[PDB]
């Protein structure tokens, strides 16, 4: 016997106490060591309901990641309200590492193992674990990076596809790499390279998946309709520097129409900018950091998911229009914690 419950979790990690990189520092005094011999066992003849869209584990991970960045990303200036906060702002070492979320005594986590699970509803093949797998807390917009991959098919996740105020998480089958560099002029100009060939192939099989869920209406992609640069652009942090990359070429219907068309294959160069004045995702305000370091600043990452928002209203179509980005940062964790839920033993 057990029941859905919520409780304060602890985290587990392999952070090096000697290292200076900020994730290792936070985890060293905030988490405990991983269990080397972790036991998980199938729950024979059991069917459980999961709901990735209402899962307190997500709120808990968010509170930690917010806590990490506050402790670790010290801006020279922080602007909020009519307050101007000025501290010391030295360059840091920044590379996310896997954190495990674990239950205390009396409780336990349930894991859905259906390869096709979409985040909500019954799950057949279930097991139980002390801790989740290791989740890199990668903060990004539009694209999900360095996450885990959908097991069998590409998987569309939403709390309600018919509700245009609800985020769509596309979970990729296979991953497409993006190669961002700020070469060793303009110290903030950068660019991201993507194998144009593989991305269109994938993106096309995404449109087909969406056609499945939207009754074969024409599926169209468009750039965001507005908002702060943090959402109109693929926004992420690399080596402690804040990148903003124009994804307009990534949502380029020309190559999605399947038309055997020229330069659809071959490398795609997204122009990026490194900014020092950023609008914080955690809390309401602006943060100003010092200019970028020198040398070749290079983060190669895996695209493993896509966040979409669907245009509301009107119809009288014919088609359905999707734009990159959606939701909030909690959605990034949600996309990794989707197969887990905490229950209490009695």
């Amino acid at each position, epitope marked *: 016997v057990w029941k859905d419950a919520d409780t304060t979790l602890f985290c587990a990690s392999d952070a090096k106490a000697h290292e200076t990189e900020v994730h290792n520092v936070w985890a060293t005094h905030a988490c405990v060591p991983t269990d080397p011999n972790p036991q998980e066992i199938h729950l024979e003849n059991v069917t459980e309901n999961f709901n990735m869209w209402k899962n307190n584990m997500v709120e808990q991970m968010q509170e930690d990641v917010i806590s990490l960045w506050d402790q670790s990303l010290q801006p020279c200036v922080k602007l909020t309200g009519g307050s101007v906060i000025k501290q010391a702002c030295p360059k840091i070492s920044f590379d996310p590492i896997p954190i495990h979320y674990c239950t205390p005594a009396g409780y336990v986590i349930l894991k859905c193992n259906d390869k096709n699970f979409n985040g909500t509803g019954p799950c057949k093949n279930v097991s139980s674990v002390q801790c989740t797998h290791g989740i890199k807390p990668v903060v990004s917009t539009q694209l999900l990076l360095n996450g885990s991959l959908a097991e069998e098919e590409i998987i569309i996740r939403s709390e309600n596809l018919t509700n245009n105020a609800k985020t769509i998480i596309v979970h990729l089958n296979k991953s497409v790499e993006i190669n961002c560099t700020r070469p060793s002029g303009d110290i903030r100009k950068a660019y991201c390279e993507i194998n144009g060939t593989k991305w269109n192939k994938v993106l096309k099989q995404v449109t087909e998946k969406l056609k499945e869920h939207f009754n074969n209406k024409t599926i169209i992609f468009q750039p965001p309709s507005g*908002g702060d640069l943090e959402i109109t652009m693929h926004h992420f942090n690399c080596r402690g520097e804040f990148f903003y990359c124009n994804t307009t070429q990534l949502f380029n219907n020309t190559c999605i129409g399947n038309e055997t068309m020229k330069g659809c294959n071959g490398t795609i160069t997204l122009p990026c900018k490194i900014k020092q004045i950023i609008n914080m995702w955690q809390g309401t305000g602006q943060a100003m950091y010092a200019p970028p370091i020198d040398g070749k600043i290079n983060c190669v990452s895996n695209i493993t998911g896509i966040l979409l928002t669907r245009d*509301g209203g009107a119809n009288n179509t014919s088609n359905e229009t999707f734009r990159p980005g959606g939701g909030n940062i909690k959605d990034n964790w949600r996309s990794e914690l989707y197969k887990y839920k905490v229950v209490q033993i009695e």
Partner: antibody
Amino acid sequence: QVHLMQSGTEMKKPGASVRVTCQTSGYTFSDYFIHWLRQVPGRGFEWMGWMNPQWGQVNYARTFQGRVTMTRDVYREVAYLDLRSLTFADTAVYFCARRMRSQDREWDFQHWGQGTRIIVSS
Amino acid sequence: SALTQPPSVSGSPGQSITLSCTGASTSVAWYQQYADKAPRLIVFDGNKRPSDISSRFSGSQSGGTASLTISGLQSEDEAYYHCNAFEFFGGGTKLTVLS
């Protein structure tokens, strides 16, 4: 108590643009979307779009796409609606609205501004 | 006119009456609107009533068919009534109360 307080009546000429302001108060502005709708008196509401004040994300009705923008001022706690290329077809009362607390339902509009009359005439 | 509502409906003081809203793709919300005034939410999620709304008002909905029942009608109930499901609204119903 939550209050949505809109700017006054605008009389505009065809081809012009108008901005309507919606001053928020009584709650944490960043925690809720602001929607805009319009209505010809005696008729039904027409939804125009939503705006998420966090990072300013917006979702506009296909009808208004390219003619509308919804912005905000996170500190002063105000949402703006801008509409351009006005026509007599845009004469109406314009409202901002906000959902009920907590619900998770996004479309239950407990809170409305008082409405702003926009009159388009040459 | 995504959702379907009769444009006009009339009732007598003291009796019940049920306004209808058809075509909904989810559970509906209902609003009362006086002329030249702002709407106010009278039921949400098809049949839920906000704590401050009079018990004379009640909602019921099956699939896309939604209904709003007002009992013990009063002249003060004369207004437009609207319903939405997501971003889709009805055309509004003007309720008259024959005074």
